[PDB]
Amino acid sequence: CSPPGETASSEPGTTPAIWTGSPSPAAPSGEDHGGGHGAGAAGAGETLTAELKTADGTSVATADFQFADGFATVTIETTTPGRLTPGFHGVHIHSVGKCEANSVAPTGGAPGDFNSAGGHFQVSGHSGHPASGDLSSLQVRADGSGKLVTTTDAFTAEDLLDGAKTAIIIHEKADNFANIPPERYQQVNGAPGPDQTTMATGDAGSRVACGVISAG
Amino acid sequence: QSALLRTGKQLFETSCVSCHGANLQGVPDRGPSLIGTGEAAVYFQVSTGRMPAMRGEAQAPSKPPHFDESQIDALGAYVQANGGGPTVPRDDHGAVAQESLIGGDVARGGDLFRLNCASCHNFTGKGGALSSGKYAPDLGDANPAQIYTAMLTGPQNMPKFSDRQLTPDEKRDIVAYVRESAETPSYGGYGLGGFGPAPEGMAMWIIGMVAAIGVAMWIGSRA
């Protein structure tokens, strides 16, 4: 006999729609928490990234700051192809983590990503030299990508989980951090030294990108 | 060289344009199209001898070659200039590379010959039957460049194992296997073909069992 399930030519099929493959609940016996580490303190993990947001809500860069072996490793990679400008960018840790479009903690003009309660996110007793608020440069070449992987041991996972969450910001200019020599330069008031605003944070423009470091 | 293309055209006009239409087309139901097949295809199909053929049958079989290596380059470069496709691998002399094609591995070639094609031929590369009159041929009388250009542009009923289906490492590896499987001697006696049990049966009967019954009739009498 002939087998019953054959011989039916309809219209010869739609082309098979692209395999949007579902994820895998075979692996799913495991929940990815904040991470696993030591840190004999109030408690933290070993991995907490960040998403740098612009003034339109879109992502510009992506930071990842975490304590691994007593050294806060911070890797800032690019997110968009044409976000940053053709030049060096100055990374700086802000004390408040609000990446608002227009906000100002003190009485003054609300600039772009200026929701911090001051400048550099230093220690709770530190106000002077280049602490954990100031960071190295993540320069953007003609390709439009700024990557900077550094290891700053000034802060750790117990310092970034404060009462106010911190952030990582990048302006349209580079990172100066009081790089004015007093032997040849001069101030507008004739002073040999630099300004206090240039001592708190680096000399740059308005903050273009900003991202909260609370696992963003 | 343009004179080499002209030599390919002079040999092309006076051997095949009854079945390739002289614009490298296909004469319908008498000989298929020929562009895009390329210099590798013409090297395998005339260097073996097959395509300067004489009838359209079940499959056009092997034969002595109708042109020599000084003219296969002309004919293949002519078909590649009119069409364009796979080319025959050539060494540092400009001639057709035949010894630099044996790859550095055999066991990978053994497993890959065995998986991908030895269904059709045999384990050692003897022939195998195919559907309606057509048949796989023996791989013993096979130049290694003809083996590479045989799997590279599949002539008749064999899949063209392309440059991307099998990588040239893998194809050099397969031609390393078949030139040391159809060349190595049968370890441990006469090789009753390459395929086992049917020649072993027929050589059990007329060699072994006929001798056994002949001994049995020399020893015992008849009454």
Partner: protein
């Protein structure tokens, strides 16, 4: 399949979209007695098996053209993945190996 020979194809039921353009995926284990039918003839489009020499038509669906087989050798659905890689669009619609009692309902 060479795309000059895509007008000779006639699919069967529940199986019209199991191509991918001209990519077909037929199984290698044959219809009856389960040998791999790894002989394939282009330009005639017949999956020939070696163990009992049973042809199958590569064009329409692997119906046995000739041989001791009487069943369509099974066809696997095809799509491309994200990043453009060939993936199976599910399972076979029929049990793929050789035949036995509990089959075909």
């Amino acid at each position: 399949i060479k795309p000059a020979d895509m007008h000779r194809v006639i699919k069967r039921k529940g199986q019209e979209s199991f191509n991918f353009g001209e990519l077909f995926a037929y199984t290698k284990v044959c219809s009856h007695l389960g040998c791999p039918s790894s002989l394939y003839e282009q330009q005639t489009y017949r999956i020939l098996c070696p163990c009992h020499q049973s042809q199958f038509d590569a064009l329409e669906f692997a119906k046995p053209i000739f041989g001791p087989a009487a069943r369509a050798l099974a066809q696997l659905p095809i799509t491309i993945d994200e990043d453009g890689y060939l993936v199976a669009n599910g399972d076979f619609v029929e049990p793929v190996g050789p035949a036995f009692w509990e089959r075909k309902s």
